[PDB]
């Protein structure tokens, strides 16, 4: 089956959190393998506690490891920006299995504002020639995690071939977003130009290229 | 030391069975009290278990999964492989090697692997079209220009693109992936250069697709 860990769970910039795992009597109640693991994007598990209580090596002593019957529980005092993760319960079963929770996605929240960077892209040579057009627009380090971005042919708005990515978290712990125009070298020629308006936190960062 | 890298297809039809297999370095997989296993997660999912097999070599697996799971190993190349078989999307996931430090003691997984993608889909693969973009520094720091390869059309992840063959890594950003109403993925990579180098440096994208075989080196010269 599967251990039952909240989808979420957001914390102070400071300090404490507690994330609970849920089993039964014939895996978290009989045996203490509970072993927890932090994820971060894009990266694969990292071992953070075992046998219920074991911290692992190099681990700090703000990450607690409790259990009360069948759930087990994860404690972090006083969070960092590295601990912006999603989290993972897991336990031995009967007879030599393994079994991992739902996983609970770490949120810090008193993190400062960050505005957007925006960069803008004409079609290459390469792809009008290629009878194709597409307008690159990139926007990376921004916090929080959400953006609206509106195309402009001169001043005029544009909604068809637009695809706009979700704001996924960087390495840094800000949040990246592409959006891509799609248009024909015929369109990108009758025009003056087009631009990239980003919309973040009430400001706007605008960039424009021409033909 | 202890060292895992998955093998496997990035694209499976299905009706095919997947031959994933995890090779072991800086340690012996026949040896102590060590335990390998399987772990999946999809897309953005939660991890699941696959199942074991330990130094002794006998293997125990997930019992929902167990049907159409048949582990193996091979102690002479130092390597484990999974073999699963009447595959549905469901089993689209990034695929995981993992090692049990101690088997007398307990379940933890202390050393992973940095995980293979695999994608069930009736769904050809499409090689990226490379386009080049050229710098100016309109939204950028003085001094500083912005270029970077467009990664287009692909099926399916991932692309994985570096510049001048690994040489060049400071301010390299390689955006997540756009899945467009196509079906087809899109991305880029970005470096920020100082403008001084543009008239000197030559720079070059590497692009890899492994599913669909393409390799593609653009070099991205101002216009």
């Known amino acids: 089956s599967a251990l039952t860990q909240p989808p979420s769970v957001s914390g102070t910039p400071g300090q404490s959190v507690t994330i609970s795992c849920a089993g039964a009597?014939?895996?978290?109640?009989?045996?203490?393998?509970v072993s927890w693991y932090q994820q971060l994007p894009g990266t694969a598990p990292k071992l953070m506690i075992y046998?219920?209580?074991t911290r692992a090596s190099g681990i700090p002593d703000r990450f607690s490891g409790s259990k009360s019957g069948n759930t087990a529980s994860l404690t972090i005092s006083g969070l960092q920006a590295e601990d912006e993760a999603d989290y993972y319960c897991?336990?031995?079963?009967?007879?030599?299995?393994?079994?991992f929770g739902t996983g609970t996605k770490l949120t810090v929240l008193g993190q400062p504002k960050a505005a957007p960077s925006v960069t803008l892209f004409p079609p290459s040579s390469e792809e009008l020639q290629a009878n194709k057009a597409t307008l690159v627009c990139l926007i990376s380090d921004f916090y929080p995690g959400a953006v609206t971005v509106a195309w402009k042919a001169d001043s005029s708005p544009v909604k068809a071939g637009v695809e706009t990515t979700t704001p996924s978290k960087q390495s840094n712990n800000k949040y990246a977003a592409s959006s891509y125009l799609s248009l024909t070298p015929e369109q990108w020629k009758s025009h003056r130009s087009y631009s990239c308006q980003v919309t973040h936190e009430g400001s706007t960062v605008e960039k424009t290229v021409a033909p | 030391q202890v060292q895992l890298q998955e093998s496997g297809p990035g694209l499976v039809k299905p009706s095919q069975t997947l031959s994933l297999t995890c090779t072991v370095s800086?340690?012996?997989?026949?040896?102590?009290?060590?335990?390998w296993s399987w772990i999946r997660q999809p897309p953005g999912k939660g991890l699941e278990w696959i199942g074991v097999?330990?130094?002794?070599?006998?293997?125990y697996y997930s019992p929902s999964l167990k049907s159409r799971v048949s582990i193996s190993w091979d102690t002479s190349k130092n390597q484990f492989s999974l073999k699963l078989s009447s595959v549905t999307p469901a089993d689209t996931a990034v695929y995981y090697c993992?090692?049990?430090?101690?088997?007398?003691?307990?379940?933890?997984?202390?050393?992973w692997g940095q995980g293979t993608m695999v994608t069930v889909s009736s769904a050809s693969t499409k090689g990226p079209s490379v386009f080049p973009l050229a710098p100016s520094s309109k939204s950028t720091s003085g001094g500083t220009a912005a270029l970077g390869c467009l990664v287009k059309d692909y099926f399916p992840e991932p692309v994985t693109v570096s510049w001048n063959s690994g040489a060049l890594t400071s301010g390299v950003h390689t955006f997540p992936a756009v899945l467009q109403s196509s079906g087809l993925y899109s991305l880029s990579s970005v470096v920020t250069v100082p403008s001084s180098s543009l008239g000197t440096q030559t720079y070059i994208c590497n692009v890899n697709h492994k599913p669909s075989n393409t390799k593609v080196d653009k070099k991205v010269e101002p216009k």
């Open positions: 993992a090692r049990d430090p101690d088997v007398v003691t307990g379940f933890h997984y202390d050393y």
């Open positions: 800086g340690g012996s997989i026949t040896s102590r009290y060590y335990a």
């Open positions: 097999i330990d130094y002794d070599g006998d293997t």
């Open positions: 009597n014939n895996d978290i109640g009989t045996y203490a393998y």
């Open positions: 046998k219920v209580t």
């Open positions: 897991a336990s031995y079963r009967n007879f030599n299995n393994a079994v």
